[PDB]
Write an enzyme that holds these catalytic residues in place. Structure first.
Site: not given
Ligand SMILES: COCCOCC(=O)Nc1cccc(F)c1
Length: 330
Positions: A35, A199
């Protein structure tokens, strides 16, 4: 040193991935959920409340010649899905894919929430976010990666998740055979303890690319792609009959649909998520409504590039002095 381990979907939907991990002496192999959004290595154990264990493999510290109680230490964690676990702490030898760390904090669960009990395939979590998020008190502990880092050939790990197929986690090296083209690296903020990046924009299907900054985290422990409501609405508007369902808890679409791809930007580069990756199948067994793999991050407080996005790429988690992320197509 290096390590290399195969990671395998837990089910036909790629709801999560499990990776075998050796703990203790002799080794006890548990299948852990790696994770990159959390920082605790915790396991089902001989200490876990018996009614909360249903098919998981447990770690038994009393059977490990190298286990030691980390006296006084406790831990307690809550996940973005509402799940939780807590317990006490041992140090022990932990190996992943041939890479060994001695003295790793192994957090032994005394209590786990219902979602963990109900998932017999996941024996615990191995956190790969920054150690500043670790929940051990009163002495915070390091992640497996942070303990391994100085020994590694290069201070990196890579995630290469499969679509309906196994993939790989590598530590200490970048497998130049595992991706196509070049790797585009992008800046990381560690301010919230995550692999947080920005992004450069998105496209839906064959549509034009929209240049827009989208902060979010690279999180292998989250199944879906959670993005701003504007972006998500723009995607699902291209699927006839798709709608957001408050009863179901997100966007659903007709199971008869063909989904468009979704592209996200990494600097000047582009990662394309095929439409099939965004299908999470019937909302209930036999339903003709299907659950979407792109969902709104509204009310989460962060955008999350979970497995739907990451599995479309070869992802480098660069833990050098100034961390960075890399993405390549594959
Ligand atoms: C310093 O830890 C304080 C306690 O934190 C509680 C806690 O649930 N933290 C946490 C939850 C999810 C992910 C993650 F990385 C950390």
């Amino acid at each position: 040193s290096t390590g290399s381990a195969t990671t395998t979907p837990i089910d036909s939907l790629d709801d999560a991935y499990i990776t075998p991990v050796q703990i203790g002496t002799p080794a006890q192999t548990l299948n852990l959920d790696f994770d990159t959004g959390s920082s605790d290595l915790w396991v089902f154990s001989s200490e876990t409340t018996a009614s909360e264990v249903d098919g998981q493999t447990i770690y038994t510290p009393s059977k490990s010649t190298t286990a030691k109680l980390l006296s006084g230490a406790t831990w307690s964690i809550s996940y973005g899905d509402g799940s939780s676990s807590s317990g006490d702490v041992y140090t022990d030898t932990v190996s992943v894919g041939g890479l060994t760390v001695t003295g790793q904090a192994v957090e032994s669960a005394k209590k786990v929430s219902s979602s963990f009990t109900e998932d017999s395939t996941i024996d615990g979590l191995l956190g790969l976010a920054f150690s500043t998020l670790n929940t051990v008190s009163p002495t915070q502990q390091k992640t497996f990666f942070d303990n391994a880092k100085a020994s590694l050939d290069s201070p990196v790990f890579t995630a290469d998740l499969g679509y309906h197929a196994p993939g790989t986690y590598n530590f200490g090296f970048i497998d130049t055979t595992a991706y196509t083209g070049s790797i585009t690296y992008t800046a990381v903020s560690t301010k919230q303890g995550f692999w947080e990046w920005t992004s450069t924009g998105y496209a839906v299907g064959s549509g034009t690319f929209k240049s827009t900054s989208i902060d979010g985290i690279a999180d292998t422990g989250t199944t879906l792609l959670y993005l701003p409501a504007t972006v998500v609405s723009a995607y699902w508007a291209q699927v006839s009959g798709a709608k957001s369902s408050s009863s179901v808890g997100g966007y659903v679409f007709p199971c008869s649909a063909t989904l468009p791809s979704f592209t996200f930007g990494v600097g000047s580069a582009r990662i394309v998520i095929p439409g099939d990756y965004i299908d999470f199948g019937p909302i209930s067994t036999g339903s003709s409504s299907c659950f979407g793999g792109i969902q709104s991050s509204a009310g989460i407080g962060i955008n999350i590039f979970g497995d739907v996005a990451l599995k479309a790429a070869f992802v480098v988690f660069n833990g050098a002095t100034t961390p960075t992320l890399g993405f390549a197509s594959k």
